[PDB]
């Protein structure tokens, strides 16, 4: 598909994020070539966002809710579920695949 | 000091960019961790700009002019002559040294 999760470390396996849930994550995204383009880990500023509401790239919206609380996975997002052909210039060229390490630290009030 | 050059390949050793010149070049930028953050070279869209007048980061304003027409060098630019404390979000963290591969394709009307 447009997004695929490799599971790297298992979450709790019951608590998954449904739509409109307020997700809290740490991540690091690279390009296929290996360049780190953004990392909430490096900034020690854990990213919070609402989920099924399209405030983040489709690959994220669609891919995160399949992680349970505490899970550590990797998201592979095709340009089509990413920043499209346009991209996010200097950082993310157009038609860029994305590889995010992702850690789910909380769903709404949960941690 | 602030920017350091490393001539990789010699230009014509006659034609140097003086201030207020319009330069044409082909560049690749990387963080100290090997991550490429921008590259006219990959876009195949050679960047053009005026040099002494602060329409690029200072590291360039002061490096590019040390190069002659045709030269390939490597600029090393401290955060201080770069993006400084703020950096450039997503791609370029705060307080980041930069390493630009640079090719001086043209000075005003020369190639």
Numbering used by the authors:
A (entry chain B), B (entry chain A): 1 to 111
From the paper:
The 12-kDa FK506-binding protein (FKBP12) is a ubiquitously expressed peptidyl-prolyl isomerase with considerable homology between fungal pathogens and is thus a prime candidate for future targeting efforts to generate a panfungal strategy. PPIase proteins all catalyze the cis/trans isomerization of peptide bonds N terminal to proline residues in polypeptide chains. In addition to its role as a PPIase, FKBP12 is a member of the immunophilin family and is the target of the immunosuppressive drugs FK506 and rapamycin. Three extended loops, which have been called the 40s loop (between β2 and β3), the 50s loop (between β3′ and α1), and the 80s loop (between β4 and β5), surround a deep active-site pocket that binds both FK506 and rapamycin.
Thus, to assess if this interaction occurs in solution, we made a single cysteine mutation, V91C, in the A. fumigatus protein to try to capture a disulfide cross-linked complex. This residue was chosen for mutation because the structure revealed that the V91 and V91′ (where the prime indicates the other subunit of the dimer) side chains are within <4.0 Å of each other and that when they are mutated to cysteines in silico they could form a disulfide bond in the intermolecular dimer. When the proteins were purified from both strains in the absence of a reducing agent and subjected to nonreducing SDS-PAGE, the samples revealed the presence of two species, which were consistent with FKBP12 monomers and dimers. When a reducing agent (β-mercaptoethanol) was added, the proteins ran as monomers. We next separated the V91C dimer from the monomer via size exclusion chromatography and crystallized and solved the structure of the dimer to 3.2 Å resolution. The structure revealed a disulfide cross-linked dimer. Interestingly, although revealing the same general dimer that we observed in the A. fumigatus and C. albicans apo FKBP12 structures, in the FKBP12(V91C) structure, Pro90 is slightly shifted from the active site and adopts a twisted conformation, suggesting that the structure may have captured an intermediate state of catalysis. In fact, the conformation of the Pro90 residues in the structure is closer to the trans than the cis state and overlays of the trans state of the protein to form an all-trans dimer revealed a clash. This finding suggests the intriguing possibility that part of the mechanism of prolyl isomerization by FKBPs is dictated by the conformation of the substrate during catalysis.
